[PDB]
Amino acid sequence: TENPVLQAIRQRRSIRRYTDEAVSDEAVRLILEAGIWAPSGLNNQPCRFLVIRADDPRCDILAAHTRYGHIVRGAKVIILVFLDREAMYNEVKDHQAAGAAVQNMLLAAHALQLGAVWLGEIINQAATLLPALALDPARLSFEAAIAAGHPAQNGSSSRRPLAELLLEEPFP
Amino acid sequence: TENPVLQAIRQRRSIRRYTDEAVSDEAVRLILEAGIWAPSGLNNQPCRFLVIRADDPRCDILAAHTRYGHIVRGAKVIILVFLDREAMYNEVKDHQAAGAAVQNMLLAAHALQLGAVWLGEIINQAATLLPALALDPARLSFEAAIAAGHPAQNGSSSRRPLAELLLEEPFPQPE
Ligand SMILES: Cc1cc2nc3c(=O)[nH]c(=O)nc-3n(C[C@H](O)[C@H](O)[C@H](O)COP(=O)(O)O)c2cc1C
Ligand SMILES: Cc1cc2nc3c(=O)[nH]c(=O)nc-3n(C[C@H](O)[C@H](O)[C@H](O)COP(=O)(O)O)c2cc1C
């Protein structure tokens, strides 16, 4: 039996090039819903979200603040992920929570047959980007941007074998 | 209603009570495989894992360094998650990657009809706990422990409405 959840986890790829087809509001809502249901340490739910569509002037602003402008410009929708500092309890664990949210969103995108890619280089420019977007970096920590669209490529990656990542070999 | 991946994301719960049923090596392997396939910056793959079964004396060590000893002693398997400090490129982003790995493992456990819970309070004791497990805190950052077993309870939780979590309303009809 090939479990669809396990299959999705294994087959989800960073997709960085999209077709010209529209991404529906309903798809975006479903992806966002996946994000909000990720866990958080105290059920503090520190993540906040901002949707930026291709036709939005803010797409150019985002592109201007990352080396991956071509991906940003090719995407149909970009979901920006932040932590509300007033909802945080622990820096390390709230960043882990943001990762869990992003992962849920990437899996949901894949499950909807959309392609997406986690963009983290862009967060290096948070200090100039947030003000450019009229957002307050004193209140918000910028965690990630997810670029998405209908896929125009299959994606390709690799991982080292499980046995190398285990600190001790647990099987007989 | 129709999508199993979306259902899993929504229905996955922190399960803290388990039956006495064994968790197979194959289940543990499938969970770990889900973990290593989470994304990481640069595909650096900074996460490292240590499996501790219930019958392992190291469970007693784990239990002595957490206020959640009932969960620790009741679990059939615990997966310790770490970042390899040599493989890190950015602490925030690598913590996020550890979160994505943990989340994949929790979804994988759920998909396998297992109950699991992300334990993070335990990492507060890393400085004393790691050396007790013969691990080097100069080499590894302790990110989380996942306690797991066949479920002896359904969990329950709540989330704020999406509308309260958006910085802006993206749909024509406000949320
Ligand atoms: C924290 C983080 C930041 C990332 N930043 C970028 C980035 O800015 N640009 C990019 O193209 N991919 C980025 N990625 C995607 C990774 O390169 C990708 O996950 C990795 O190469 C493995 O490929 P896969 O996602 O297909 O499994 C990032 C991934 C993570 C988890
Ligand atoms: C960073 C992190 C640390 C956590 N630590 C603990 C913990 O030590 N003990 C515990 O019982 N649950 C812990 N949890 C589980 C949360 O309490 C749980 O995810 C949250 O209450 C929402 O419940 P749900 O997982 O059923 O959706 C942790 C979750 C996260 C994301």
Side-chain angles (χ1 to χ4, degrees), chain A, chain B residues 1 3-16 18-175:
Chain A
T1 189
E2 176 162 15
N3 188 280
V5 175
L6 300 182
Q7 188 180 341
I9 288 168
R10 175 62 179 80
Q11 295 182 343
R12 171 219 56 80
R13 293 277 66 78
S14 289
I15 300 300
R16 304 176 172 93
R17 180 169 63 90
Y18 318 97
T19 71
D20 201 22
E21 296 169 287
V23 172
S24 72
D25 281 341
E26 174 63 5
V28 172
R29 189 190 67 80
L30 289 165
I31 291 170
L32 286 165
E33 283 288 323
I36 72 178
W37 280 95
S40 57
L42 307 175
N43 199 28
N44 50 308
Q45 302 175 60
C47 294
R48 301 293 178 267
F49 309 87
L50 175 58
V51 180
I52 301 302
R53 288 188 169 275
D55 69 335
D56 196 303
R58 288 173 293 179
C59 284
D60 294 353
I61 300 172
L62 291 168
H65 296 259
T66 176
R67 304 285 181 75
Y68 301 96
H70 68 277
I71 298 177
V72 168
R73 283 182 275 273
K76 288 307 182 204
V77 72
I78 299 172
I79 298 174
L80 302 177
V81 182
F82 307 84
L83 297 175
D84 178 348
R85 295 182 205 276
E86 298 181 9
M88 292 177 74
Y89 86 107
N90 184 280
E91 294 194 65
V92 166
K93 299 173 220 182
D94 288 320
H95 289 303
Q96 292 172 340
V102 173
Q103 188 59 16
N104 274 357
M105 286 187 287
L106 295 182
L107 294 167
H110 175 86
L112 291 168
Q113 298 197 335
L114 292 168
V117 60
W118 184 328
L119 302 175
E121 186 279 331
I122 194 171
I123 82 168
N124 294 352
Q125 288 66 247
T128 56
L129 177 57
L130 270 55
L133 294 177
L135 297 173
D136 180 21
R139 180 68 182 276
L140 301 169
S141 171
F142 180 34
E143 299 296 294
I146 300 170
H150 292 272
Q153 57 178 202
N154 290 324
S156 192
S157 195
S158 64
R159 290 297 185 281
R160 303 196 287 118
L162 176 53
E164 291 185 8
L165 312 187
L166 282 158
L167 297 179
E168 168 181 292
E169 306 307 339
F171 308 124
Chain B
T1 291
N3 194 304
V5 176
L6 303 178
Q7 290 173 16
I9 290 162
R10 173 60 181 82
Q11 293 161 5
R12 174 216 54 84
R13 293 275 68 76
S14 289
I15 298 307
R16 304 176 170 89
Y18 321 96
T19 71
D20 287 337
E21 187 176 345
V23 177
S24 68
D25 278 353
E26 183 58 10
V28 173
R29 194 189 69 80
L30 292 170
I31 290 165
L32 289 170
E33 283 291 329
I36 71 170
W37 280 92
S40 66
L42 312 172
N43 195 29
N44 285 156
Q45 300 165 53
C47 298
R48 298 295 181 273
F49 311 88
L50 180 53
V51 177
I52 302 293
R53 291 183 167 277
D55 54 14
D56 191 315
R58 287 172 288 187
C59 283
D60 285 356
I61 299 176
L62 292 174
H65 294 271
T66 185
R67 289 189 165 79
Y68 297 90
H70 184 66
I71 296 174
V72 173
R73 298 187 193 284
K76 303 313 159 190
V77 63
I78 293 169
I79 296 170
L80 306 180
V81 187
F82 308 83
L83 293 167
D84 178 334
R85 296 184 185 276
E86 289 303 308
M88 296 177 77
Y89 82 112
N90 183 283
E91 307 202 359
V92 165
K93 295 180 221 183
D94 286 324
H95 290 305
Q96 292 171 341
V102 173
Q103 187 62 15
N104 272 0
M105 290 191 288
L106 292 180
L107 291 173
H110 176 86
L112 293 169
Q113 307 187 14
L114 297 173
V117 58
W118 182 326
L119 296 178
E121 167 274 358
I122 190 162
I123 79 178
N124 302 347
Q125 291 70 247
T128 57
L129 177 58
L130 266 57
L133 294 171
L135 302 174
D136 185 6
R139 184 51 185 287
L140 299 165
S141 167
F142 181 33
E143 302 292 298
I146 304 183
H150 294 268
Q153 75 181 181
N154 296 296
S156 78
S157 187
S158 70
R159 291 295 187 279
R160 296 182 71 188
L162 178 52
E164 295 180 14
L165 299 176
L166 285 165
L167 303 179
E168 277 194 359
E169 176 55 51
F171 311 129
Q173 195 65 59
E175 284 271 3

